[PDB]
């Protein structure tokens, strides 16, 4: 299971977006035992709260998701091959680190409640 | 996060169903450690129940879901309007609480091992 | 009460852009889907486009499916249908309707319960 | 598209029946049929929906059926603003939404 963990963090992000199931699988599990039992249970809260953003973005089961949200060039200008096949996404988050709550609001809110009603109203026809 | 949390409480069902993630984005977080562990490892166990029983449903990563159950007057023989624009969640909640069961179970077995079924039996053609 | 008054007629040359409008008074515009019905001079009615009460499912005629384009904007109380590349069978007196669908937290429309005055299209 | 009697004649007091008969995909399929009154000059406006539903603000004598693949506009007491062309509509499903038919001219 350990094996590869991390192995692709120097690699281009698009030759790191083909691992994503090594890392998605090392994220599971006295006075001593209620700290360990702490840890798995903050470790358990916070894997729940990651597939909840998953799942309020139309995203469950899913590793890699595309969504209806356009990138704004003010979050980043540049190219593709540029972010893909010349950086990494340790590099990329900390580049984008002060725009991710504008994409995940934009995620959460917008995009997902407006095409899952408008799901509901095709479902209607 | 917080904001806006049950703030259409009362408002219409209407106008409360489009307010559900932030809801459910609050709905997941000595002596006195292991008390607060235990009400940590209750609302874990109780959001993993409720996501069950939508997964159970073929509602899962969704917070409004669709189904194939016709609804049954008996339950209630109220018209759309009087539902989504002139009653609140807590009402319907106290109207339908002795019916919720029967339409769980509607759910439950029923329809959706019915329909898995067929999309097995479509897979195959 | 309801009142639809459609603006923007005018002579289009064969192939020509057009933008039809309608404006509404007297209800919550945003509460209703609306719709395009055209009236040929020698003909009967055809459906032409509907759009839903919040602007986002637009419903368009074979025809008319890639030229034609309907949109709605809920604060300006205004319902516009761009037509692009306008053919000679589009000549017709345009009517913006209220009514053809209705979201899942109220009942059924299929049916246009308010039309506007007209607009007249030649082309 | 459906079919309409091109006309229909009627005189003051008794009634008359306009028709529309269609296939079985829009009206024996879905119970969404409309009948619309365009006076002369003016713009449609809704007499019937539903088959049978009538809106308020339109007198009993407008009544609406539905038979298979048929439906049926009755219009009793016939006056003199009963003249107008009558066109009836059917919801035919999600990618062809709504189906007209050809007017009827009413003489009274």
């Known amino acids: 299971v350990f094996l590869g963990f991390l192995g692709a963090a120097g690699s281009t992000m698009g030759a790191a977006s083909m691992t994503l199931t090594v890392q998605a699988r090392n994220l599971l599990s006295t006075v001593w035992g209620i700290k360990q039992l702490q840890a798995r249970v903050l470790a358990v809260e916070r894997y729940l709260r990651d597939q909840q953003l998953l799942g309020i973005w139309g995203c469950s089961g899913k590793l890699i998701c595309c969504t209806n949200v356009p990138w704004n060039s003010s979050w980043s200008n540049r190219n593709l091959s540029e972010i893909w096949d010349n950086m990494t996404w340790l590099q990329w988050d900390k580049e984008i680190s002060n725009y991710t709550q504008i994409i995940y609001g934009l995620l959460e809110e917008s995009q997902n409640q407006q095409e899952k009603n408008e799901q509901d109203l095709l479902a209607l026809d | 996060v917080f904001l806006g949390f049950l703030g259409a409480a009362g408002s219409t069902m209407g106008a409360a169903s489009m307010t559900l993630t932030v809801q459910a984005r609050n709905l997941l977080s000595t002596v006195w450690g292991i008390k607060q562990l235990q009400a940590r490892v209750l609302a874990v166990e109780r959001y993993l129940r409720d996501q069950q029983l939508l997964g159970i449903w073929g509602c899962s990563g969704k917070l409004i879901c669709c189904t194939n159950v016709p609804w049954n007057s008996s339950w209630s023989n109220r018209n759309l309007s009087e539902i989504w624009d002139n009653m609140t969640w807590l009402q319907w909640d106290k109207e339908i609480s002795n019916y919720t069961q029967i339409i769980y179970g509607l759910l439950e077995e029923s329809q959706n091992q019915q329909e898995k079924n067929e999309q097995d039996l479509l897979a195959l053609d | 009460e309801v009142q639809l008054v459609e603006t923007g007629g005018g002579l289009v040359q064969p192939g020509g852009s057009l933008k039809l409008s309608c404006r509404a008074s007297?209800?919550?515009?945003?509460?209703?889907?609306m719709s395009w019905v055209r009236q040929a001079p020698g003909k009967g009615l055809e459906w032409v486009s509907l759009?839903?009460?919040?602007?986002?499912?637009?419903f368009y005629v074979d025809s008319v499916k890639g030229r034609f384009t309907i949109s709605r904007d809920n604060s300006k109380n205004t319902l516009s249908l761009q037509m692009h590349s306008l053919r000679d069978g589009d000549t017709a007196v345009y009517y913006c309707?209220?009514?053809?669908?209705?979201?899942?937290?109220?009942?059924?429309?299929?049916?246009?319960?308010?039309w506007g005055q007209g607009a007249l299209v030649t082309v | 598209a459906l079919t309409q009697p091109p006309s229909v004649s009627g005189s003051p007091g008794q009634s008359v029946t306009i028709s529309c008969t269609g296939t079985?995909?829009?009206?024996?399929?879905?119970?969404?049929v409309s009948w619309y009154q365009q006076h002369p000059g003016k713009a449609p406006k809704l007499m019937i929906y539903?088959?049978?539903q009538r809106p308020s603000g339109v007198s009993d004598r407008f009544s609406g059926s539905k038979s298979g693949n048929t439906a049926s506009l009755t219009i009793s007491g016939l006056q003199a603003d009963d003249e107008a062309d009558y066109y009836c509509s059917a919801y035919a499903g999600r990618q062809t939404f709504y189906i007209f038919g050809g007017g009827t001219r009413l003489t009274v």
């Open positions: 539903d088959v049978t």
């Open positions: 759009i839903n009460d919040r602007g986002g499912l637009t």
């Open positions: 079985s995909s829009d009206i024996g399929s879905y119970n969404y």
């Open positions: 309707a209220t009514g053809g669908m209705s979201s899942a937290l109220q009942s059924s429309k299929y049916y246009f319960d308010f």
């Open positions: 007297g209800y919550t515009f945003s509460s209703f889907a």
